[PDB]
Amino acid sequence: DYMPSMKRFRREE
Amino acid sequence: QGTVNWSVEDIVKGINSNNLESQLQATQAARKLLSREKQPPIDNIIRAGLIPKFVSFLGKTDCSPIQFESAWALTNIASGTSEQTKAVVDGGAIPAFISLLASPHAHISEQAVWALGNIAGDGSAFRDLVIKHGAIDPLLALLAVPDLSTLACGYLRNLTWTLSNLCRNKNPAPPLDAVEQILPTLVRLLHHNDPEVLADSCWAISYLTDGPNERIEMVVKKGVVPQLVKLLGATELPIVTPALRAIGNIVTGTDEQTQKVIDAGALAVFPSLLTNPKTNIQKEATWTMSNITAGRQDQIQQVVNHGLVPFLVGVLSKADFKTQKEAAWAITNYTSGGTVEQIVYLVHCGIIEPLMNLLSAKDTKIIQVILDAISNIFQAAEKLGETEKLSIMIEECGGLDKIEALQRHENESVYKASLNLIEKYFS
């Protein structure tokens, strides 16, 4: 919800 | 750059090419494929058997760029489903990334930190496996500087987030020794001036306090409760939210732990929290109050002294229904554990009418809770010989009609409790 994501995707810069 | 929009076939060709530079260009092309926002071909990359190659590239100390590109590719694969993360783990990625934590290149160690955060973030088993491989010491060693402000902000946020994932999830909760090893760094991060570092530190603390009173005690013993209360007062919602979660967790503990929350000055913030425009803040604040009113009579008295009972009346009167339910709980706990004088005070603040109004709700549990509260208040009234006055009070705001109607309610304990109330006080 408002918690940090469990996993994070590193997107195009 | 000539590494944009390669096919998977071309990537495989390059990675299999016996040329480190060709492998590097192909790995970068893979990274760029795997980092597009629209449906990155993670499963195609996995099916092509590339993961073991990426993992092997992690160990090429002589070619830091391919370490970086493969780290990023694997990071994004591990960000996916449990199955995709598992493909990364099964490729041997965990000790490779842990080895990369010691890299002299900040971007590479950072990418390793990120990857380990995704893997640990999958769940308890992978979290604990990351810990068994020995990630915690080098992770913490990355923060071994006199002043955290000299570290790059993004780097510090990534580290904090990964540590928070090492504190996250239950059944089982993290190993006790791992928690003890992480906690001091968490305390330090909890005093760092960056809103995201603060947010994530707070979330970590909230994870650690989400469990048995022994778990709570490990945290409370580190003396962080005053800092949590301070952060509870912050203007940034992403900070307040985990601060409040942690505080609520802590007051699910013992009377002494709860008392530590009160001594730190938490109650002074609840006029705002209980009227907060953000629904979940209000809900969690009211939940927190419900566990505080389940406390000792002197703690109930401190709730009274801080003027918080009118705010509970307020939330009961009008709020999101879930928040209202938390308020009903707060009241039932208050009346169960409170002195006669405290219950009298509660009635004088106007609790009866909104309590009665919520008896028309389509929720069996809150009906039960409210009926319980009414029972407790009637017990106080008996103790004062004022049951008739209370009966009249309930009747005048239309409570009697609702209770009479609850006699025909399908749930057993409901019509039993309501019939008892009718037969005992309304004849």
Numbering used by the authors:
A (entry chain C): 881 to 893
B (entry chain E): 71 to 497
Task: Provide text from the study.
Among the NS proteins, NS5 is the largest (103 kDa, 900 amino acids) and the most conserved with a sequence identity of around 70% among the four serotypes.
In contrast, the C-terminal region of DENV2 and 3 formed a stable complex with Impα throughout purification, and yielded well diffracting crystals. Strong positive residual electron density for residues 881–893 of DENV2 and 3 NS5 could be clearly discerned at the major NLS binding site of ARM2, 3, 4 of Impα, consistent with our cell localization data indicating that mutations within K887/R888 and R890/R891 can drastically impact nuclear accumulation. Main chain atoms of DENV2 NS5 P884, S885, M886 interact with side chain atoms of residues R238, W231, and N235 of Impα respectively. The side chain of NS5 residue K887 (P2 position) makes a salt bridge with the carboxylic group of Impα residue D192 and hydrogen bonds with T155 and a backbone interaction is also established with G150. The DENV2 NS5 residue R888 side-chain (P3 position) forms extensive interactions with Impα; its guanidinium group forms hydrogen bond interactions with N228 and also its backbone interacts with Impα side-chain residues N188 and W184.
